């Protein structure tokens, strides 16, 4: 595509520059180009890919929510413009899912990369579910659930309970349960068991790993506090 003539290394360097400049659309396009070089991504590169698209879709989600709220209060311009933002959001989700399925997930053998990508697949189907209506909604929801579940199965077998990727997966799957699947009890059970099992493993960590794990545990606690 449009980044095909740029060296992989230059795309990575430019992604990091874009992050510093808070140019997340550029950052995402550089990382998409890097993925399309066909080589597996390092841990740092996976994180650059995720941070880039999370910022892009995050802006779209916030905008979509504002417009959806106005539309509901109003109940063609509001509907048309909400639809425009919605289609752009769906396009970004489609692009990310496309990268994961061509061919990041199938080449990811290590737990840390496979869980990372499967969590992303769950996340971007979840973002689609937030704007979906009706039956498409049902199939989208089941695709999110399926990706999260496979990620959870691998994570529980291959990573310690304090692993930040595992923790972040469990955090997001619990919000999926609460907000998307209308399963608040499942969400609470997951967040509680995840928090408790991580707490019991903190004694094994260095000070820096301790800080990484406790940061995500605090997000689990923040949600439990709002939920119970």
């Amino acid at each position: 595509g449009a980044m095909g003539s740029m060296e992989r290394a230059s795309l990575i360097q430019k992604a990091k520059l874009a992050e510093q400049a808070e140019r997340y659309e550029d950052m995402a396009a550089f990382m998409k180009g890097a993925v399309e070089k066909g080589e597996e991504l390092s841990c740092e590169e996976r994180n650059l890919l995720s941070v880039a698209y999370k910022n892009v879709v995050g802006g779209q989600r916030a905008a979509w929510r504002v417009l959806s709220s106005i539309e509901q209060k109003s109940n063609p311009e509001v509907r048309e413009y909400r639809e425009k933002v919605e289609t752009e959001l769906q396009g970004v989700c489609d692009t990310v899912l496309g990268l994961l399925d061509s061919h990041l997930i199938k080449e990811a053998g290590d737990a840390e990369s496979r869980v990372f990508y499967l969590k992303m697949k769950g996340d971007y189907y979840r973002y689609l579910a937030e704007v979906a209506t009706g039956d498409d909604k049902k199939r989208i929801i089941d695709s999110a659930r399926s990706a999260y579940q496979e990620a959870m199965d691998i994570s529980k077998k291959e990573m310690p309970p304090t692993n930040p990727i595992r923790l972040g997966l469990a955090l997001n799957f619990s919000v999926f349960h609460y907000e998307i699947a209308n399963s608040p009890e499942e969400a609470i059970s997951l967040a509680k068991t995840t928090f408790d099992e991580a707490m019991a493993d903190l004694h094994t960590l260095s000070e820096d790993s301790y800080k990484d794990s406790t940061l995500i545990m605090q997000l689990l606690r923040d949600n439990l506090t709002l939920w119970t």
């Binding site: 997340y24 995720s50 941070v51 999370k54 910022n55 892009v56 879709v57 995050g58 802006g59 779209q60 989600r61 916030a62 929510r65 969590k119 996340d123 972040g168 997966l169 955090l171 997001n172 919000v175 609460y178 907000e179 995500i216 997000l219 689990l220 923040d222 949600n223 709002l226």
Partner: peptide, 10 residues
Amino acid sequence: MFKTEGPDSD
């Protein structure tokens, strides 16, 4: 919005 992983960009 409930807390999820990574940048709180929305």
